[PDB]
Amino acid sequence: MTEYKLVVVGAGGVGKSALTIQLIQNHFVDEYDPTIEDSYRKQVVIDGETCLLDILDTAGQEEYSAMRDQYMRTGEGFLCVFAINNTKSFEDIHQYREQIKRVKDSDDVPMVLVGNKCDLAARTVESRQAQDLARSYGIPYIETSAKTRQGVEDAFYTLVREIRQH
């Protein structure tokens, strides 16, 4: 039984917690309660391998971000989340990637770019924009909805598959 240590990062309110909770707990969190640092663990079979997913759900609100860097350091792969209706959250991905490089002291860190809230029609980040960013980092881009489940399992299992490529 292999353990994979996943860390979910991104601006406040983009849906890190909703994504994680939909994956692990099979419901949609409608309310917004800012996270400090939460962990989830679940045993799951991914591509025929029994493994233990340890998912760190981090703070995106600066006021709740104390020690986020030390929590992030442990991670093996990162889900870099923005919301497709929040242009600034997408623009913030660059500094999240730079923070990841710093906490890992590496420029070769498993990552997946996730554009969340794809059930909403107030899109201000077009797919191709995000595809291009991901391409520049050598990683996949996946759209998700924590509300409908679209892409949710795919996004997390893709990050496990990126860790396996490292």
Ligand X SMILES: Nc1nc2c(ncn2[C@@H]2O[C@H](COP(=O)(O)OP(=O)(O)O)[C@@H](O)[C@H]2O)c(=O)[nH]1
For position 17 contacting ligand BEF by CB under 6 A, the verdict is: yes
Least distance (Å) between residue 16 CB and ligand BEF: 6
Report 58-97 residues binding ligand BEF (CB under 6 A): 59-61
Which range touches Mg ion (CB under 5 A), out of 23-31, 32-40, 74-82, 84-92?
A: 32-40
Closer to ligand X by Cβ: residue 51 or 85: 85
Long-range Cβ contact pairs of 47-53 (< 8 A, separation 24 or more): 47/157, 47/161, 49/2, 50/1, 50/2, 51/1, 51/2, 51/3, 51/4, 51/160, 52/1, 52/2, 52/3, 52/4, 53/3, 53/4, 53/6, 53/156, 53/160
Q: Which residues sit at the interface with ligand X, rule CB under 6 A?
A: 10, 12-18, 29-32, 34-35, 60, 116-117, 119-120, 145-147
Query: What does the binding site for Mg ion look like in residue numbers (CB under 5 A)?
Result: 16-17, 35
